[PDB]
Structure prediction request, 791 residues.
Amino acid sequence: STTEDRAKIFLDNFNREAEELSYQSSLASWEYNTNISDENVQKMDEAGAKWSAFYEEQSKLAKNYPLEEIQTVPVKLQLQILQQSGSPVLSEDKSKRLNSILNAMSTIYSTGKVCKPNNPQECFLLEPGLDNIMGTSKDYNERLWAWEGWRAEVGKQLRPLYEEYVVLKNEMARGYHYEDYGDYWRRDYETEESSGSGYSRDQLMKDVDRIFTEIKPLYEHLHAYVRTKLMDTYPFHISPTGCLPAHLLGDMWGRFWTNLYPLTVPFGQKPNIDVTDAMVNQGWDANRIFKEAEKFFVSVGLPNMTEGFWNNSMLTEPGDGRKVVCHPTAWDLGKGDFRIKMCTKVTMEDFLTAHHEMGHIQYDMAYATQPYLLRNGANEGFHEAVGEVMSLSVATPKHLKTMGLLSPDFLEDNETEINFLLKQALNIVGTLPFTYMLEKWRWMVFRGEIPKEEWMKKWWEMKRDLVGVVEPVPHDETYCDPASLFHVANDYSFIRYYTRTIFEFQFHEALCRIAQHDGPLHKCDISNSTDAGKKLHQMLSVGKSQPWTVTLKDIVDSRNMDVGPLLRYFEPLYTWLQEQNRKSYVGWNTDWSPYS
Amino acid sequence: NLCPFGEVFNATRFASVYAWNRKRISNCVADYSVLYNSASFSTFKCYGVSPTKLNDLCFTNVYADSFVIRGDEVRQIAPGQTGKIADYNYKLPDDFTGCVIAWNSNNLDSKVGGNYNYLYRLFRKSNLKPFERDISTEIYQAGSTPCNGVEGFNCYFPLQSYGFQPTNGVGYQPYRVVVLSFELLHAPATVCGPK
Ligand SMILES: *[C@@H]1O[C@H](CO)[C@@H](O)[C@H](O)[C@H]1NC(C)=O
Ligand SMILES: [Zn+2]
Prediction:
C-alpha cells in the first residue's frame, strides 16, 4: 500500500500511546503543583522522561515517512509537527552543552539576587522583592540601583552563555531545513500548505513590521502623555523631547506601563470600578466566581463545564497542610480531564482571571475532537486571545451592574472611559513596541545581522528608535540586557504577545458586530448572544487542523492580521490624547540620555 | 418461563469489545417495558423496531451481546457507522433490527492507575463482517520487513488496552453496552411478550 496508509497506522499507534503517557505526566505534574513534595517531584520527572523519550523516538520514526508522499492534510501536519519538534540533529556533546547552557540560564535568573549598597547581606530577589520595588517606588536612585543591579549580576553572567546559546540553536534549526532559530520559531504562523497564498515565515516579519508603522501614532501620543506626567514625579531627570528612562516604566524591563497608572491617571477624582469590596459584602465565594463564569459561557451557547472540573480542580488554596503552586493555570490533562489550578481570592482580579482561564478550558474542550498533535491553538496568539476577549466583556460596567456587583447609579462619564482606556493602553499598547523590539533584536541576532561586538549597541539603538526608551546608565557589551527577561533566558518566543493582541481585538470586533452591539467597542458585552458563541465554537474546535488563515477568515472575515480593530477600540483615547498632547512635544530624540 | 434479562444487564463481569459475549434468550416471556423505563441506561435506541411496541411482538430467538467501550464509541455501535470499533471490533448490519442499550460504568470499571484489563483492536487487514468476532493475536505487518512473529519495526500488536481511570471525562470513561438482536425465521417462536 501507499506510505500514506502506512503513515496513518503509525500516527494511530502514536495517538493511542501518547495519550496515556501524556496523561501520566499531566497527572504527576498536577500532584506536584497541588502537593509540593520531593517524592512527587521524582514521580513528575520520571513520568515526564517517559513522555519525552517516547516523543523523541517516534519523531525519528516519523522521518521515515516522506512528507511529499502524504496527501491527506491532517496526517501531513502531524508528521511535520513530529519531525521538526524533537530529535535534535546536534552532536552528542553539543546537545548536552545546550542543556547545560539552557539549564544554567534558568538558575541564574531564578536565584540571581541583587544586594543593597551599605548592606552587603540585605539582598533582594526578583519575586517578590525587586518586582515590588520596580512597580511601586517613585525614587530615581532606588530604581536605578535595582535596574543596573539586575542587569549586571544576572545579565553579565548570561552574556557568554547567550553567545554560545545562539550558535547552538542555529545549528539545531539548520538541521530541520530552516534558515536560523528565528525561522524555526516563526513556523507556527506558516500556513505552508495552500494552493497558493501560503503564509510565509518571512511574511510574519513583514506583517508585524507594518503593524508597528500603523500603531506608532497611538504609541507616540501615549509616550508623550506619560512623559509630561512623569516629569511631575521625576522633575530633573526627564527631557521634554528626549526618550523615556527605562527604570521608571513600572517594571524592570519596561514590558508594562500599567503600574504607572497612579502617576499618569487622567482624572484622579473620578472613582474606580473595583467591585472587590462589594463581592466581600455580598458573600461571594470561590464557587460563585467560577459558577458565574460558567453562566457567562453558557449564555453565549458554549458548553457547561465537565463535572470532573468541579470536583478534581484546585479552585482555591486548599490549606490542609498541602504546599501548592499558586499560579493561575488551565489544565488540558489529555483525556477529557480539564482542571484549573488557581489559589483564588475574592477579588475583581481573580474574578476576571477566572474567565480568562475558563476560556482556555472552553477552547480545550472544543478542540478535543481533533488528534492529539493537532490539539492546540492555530498559532501562538490564538489561545490567550480567546481568554482575554471573554475577559473584556465581563469587565464592562453593564456586566458588573447585571451581576449586581456594581451600583445601578454608577456614573458613566467620558471621564470614566478615558481612565479605563488609558489603563488598558498602558498594558495593551505599551508592550507592543517592547515586544516588537525584543523579537526583532533576537531575530536579527540569529540571522547574523548584529555581531556580538554590537549586540548591546543595537539593543539600545533600537530601544531609542522603536520603543522611545533610553538607557539610564551606559552599558558595555559585557551585559545581556535582553536576557534579563524570563522569556529570553528560558528559550521562549515573545512574538506571541504581539500577535495575540492583534487577534484579540479582531475577535472582539467580530463578536460584538454579531451581537448587534450599539455603541463603542470598549463597552461591549457578548453575553446572551448565542450567535457569537457559534462563531467562536467553530474557531476553537478547528485547532491546528486548518491553516490559521482559513480559521481566522471564518470568524473575522480576513485572512491576515489587522490592527484596525485594536486602533478602533482605542479611538476614544486617541482623540483625547491628541487634544492634550497639544502644548507638548510628541516624539523623541534618539541622542538624549540621562547620563549624556 | 420468565426471561433471564437480569443476568445480562446486572452482571458483575463484562467482556472486552474484541471478545464480545453473546447469550441466547429463548423459551420465555420478556418484559421490555421494565428495561426501557429504567433511567439507569443513558442509551436505549432501537433501530428497525419501535421501542414502545417491543412488548407486543414475537421473535424466534433473542441474542444479547455484551462488551465495554469508551464514551465516544457508543455512536460507532449503531448501524451504518464506521470506526475502529465498528470496522475491527463489533459491526452491526445496515439492516439491523434490534436495540442498543448502554450506561456509564465509571464507578465499577475504572481504577486509580488505570484498568488496562479492557482492550480493543487498533489495526486489522480487512474490515469485519456483520456480527463477526476476531480473537486472533497475530502481529500486524505495516511495512515491507516481515515480522516473523515478533513485535518490532513497523510491526504493531493488533490488540491494545483501553485505559480507564476515574478522573477521565465522560467521553473517555468506560461504558457497558448490551445489544438485543431479534431473529424471526420459519420456526416456532420462543420469545414473546406477556400477552
Ligand atoms: C438490576 O438490579 C437491581 C437491584 O440492584 C434491580 O432493581 C433491577 O431490576 C435489576 N435490573 C435488571 C435488568 O436485572
Ligand atoms: Zn491565559
